[PDB]
Amino acid sequence: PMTPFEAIGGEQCIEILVDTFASYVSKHPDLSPIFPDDLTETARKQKQFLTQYLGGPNLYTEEHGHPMLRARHLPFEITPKRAEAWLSCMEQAMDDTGVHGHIREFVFERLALTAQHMVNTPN
Amino acid sequence: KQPMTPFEAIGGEQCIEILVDTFASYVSKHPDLSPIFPDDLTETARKQKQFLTQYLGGPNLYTEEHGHPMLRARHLPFEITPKRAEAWLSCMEQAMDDTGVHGHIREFVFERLALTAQHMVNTPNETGEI
Ligand code: HEM
Ligand code: HEM
Ligand SMILES: [C-]#N
Ligand SMILES: [C-]#N
């Protein structure tokens, strides 16, 4: 024991985490313009990626191949301000789904680092 | 008579401490690598030492603290190109040279590490690399 995926609560917790996150993303002025109007598909892939990243089944790469995550974000203007907005929505999502304690810090530190890596545009 | 574990054969903790500290120095200077690593590699180095210790047959310091390495999953968000894997291995080679790691243990460790690096690659090659 115990993968971050099991510690965070498994599929059930990822489901609601990402559903709540997508809701906040869709309502954030800094993010809603660059995401799809319908985030269903986006959220489906976010669940895949977070699942596989945190030690669950290899959902994302089994369907979409190599993650190449920064490259998939290149077509979008991802500014430091937008990275902040993203993490701000993940923070609220984790608060709303009960993700606390060491797993919260573990996951958020790694997504904050990842979000920094996605930045491809100055403010 | 017990053969040495690979971790013993390389010189144990004192070697792994020196090798990783040296490696992380090269990493932080490598233009292909430093952008994606944290600015302060101290936590990364601490984890690398723990990983490599158990990776080579020492105690399970990494798994006991962090859980299963699952390194391909843990590297999923990071832009790991074939080039950056070679840079990684290049810094390890230089680090091994600086720390005195030679012989069968060096080739055993490097060849295993070269397999792991290739498995971390999660971004296609760039133009000219086909
Ligand atoms: C730094 C701020 C970020 C912004 C502004 C951003 C924005 C976006 C946008 C607009 C898309 C397109 C969605 C679609 O076409 O369906 C996308 C895709 C995606 N993003 Fe993010 N993102 C950010 C960071 C992250 C982070 C930290 C992760 C960590 C897991 C992540 C994982 C993904 C995944 C898995 C996809 C699906 C890619 C695909 O297969 O098409 N992103 N992102
Ligand atoms: C192939 C080129 C590689 C690149 C570019 C690379 C890059 C990175 C980066 C940017 C991180 C994030 C640092 C952090 O969050 O602390 C990381 C974490 C890590 N890497 Fe690598 N890596 C590579 C290969 C390897 C190899 C070959 C090994 C082991 C033999 C390894 C073991 C680790 C470990 C244990 C961690 C810490 C994960 C954690 O517990 O958070 N990596 N790597
Ligand atoms: C990406 N959210
Ligand atoms: C990884 N270093």
Exposed/middle/buried for A38, CB within 10 Å: 0-12, 13-18, 19+?
exposed
CA distances from A85 to A99, A108, A118 (A): 19, 14, 13
Report d(CA B123, CA B52) in Å as an integer. Answer: 24
**Contact between A60 and B79 using a beta-carbon 8 Å cutoff:** no
Hey, what amino acid is at A2? Answer: M
Return the structure tokens found at A73. Answer: 């974000």
Query: Is B127 among the annotated ligand-binding positions?
Result: no
Q: Which residues in chain B have Cβ-Cβ distances shorter than 8 Å to A67?
A: 76-77, 122
**Contact between A67 and B76 using a beta-carbon 8 Å cutoff:** yes
Cis peptide leading into residue A2 (ω within 30°): yes
Q: Which residues in chain A have Cβ-Cβ distances shorter than 8 Å to B38?
A: 113
Asked whether the beta carbons of A78 and A118 are under 8 A apart, the reply is: yes
Hey, what amino acid is at A33? Answer: P
**Contact between B79 and A66 using a beta-carbon 8 Å cutoff:** no
Other residues' Cβ atoms within 10 Å of the Cβ of residue A85: 19
The experimental technique behind this entry is: X-ray
Relative to the CA of A114, which ligand 1 atom is closest? 27
Hey, what amino acid is at B33? Answer: L
Closest among B112, B121, B125, B114 to B89, alpha carbons compared: B114
The dotted CATH code for B1-130 is: 1.10.490.10
Helix axes A80-97, A10-27, angle to 10 degrees: 130
* Nearest-Cα residue of chain B relative to residue A2: B67
Q: Determine the straight-line distance between the first and last CA of chain B, rounded to whole angstroms.
A: 49
Other residues' Cβ atoms within 10 Å of the Cβ of residue B126: 10
- Give the alpha-carbon dihedral of B97, B21, A117, A69, to 10 degrees: 50
Query: Is B68 among the annotated ligand-binding positions?
Result: no
Return the structure tokens found at A38. Answer: 């319908």
Ligand closest to Cα of A82 equals 1
Closest among A30, A33, A6, A10 to A79, alpha carbons compared: A30
Upper half-sphere CA count for residue A51 (Cβ side, 13 Å): 21
Relative to the CA of A53, which ligand 1 atom is closest? 30
Report d(CA A46, CA A18) in Å as an integer. Answer: 7
The dotted CATH code for A1-123 is: 1.10.490.10
**Contact between A52 and B78 using a beta-carbon 8 Å cutoff:** no
Return the structure tokens found at A44. Answer: 């489906």
Query: Is A104 among the annotated ligand-binding positions?
Result: no
Q: Which residues in chain B have Cβ-Cβ distances shorter than 8 Å to A58?
A: 73
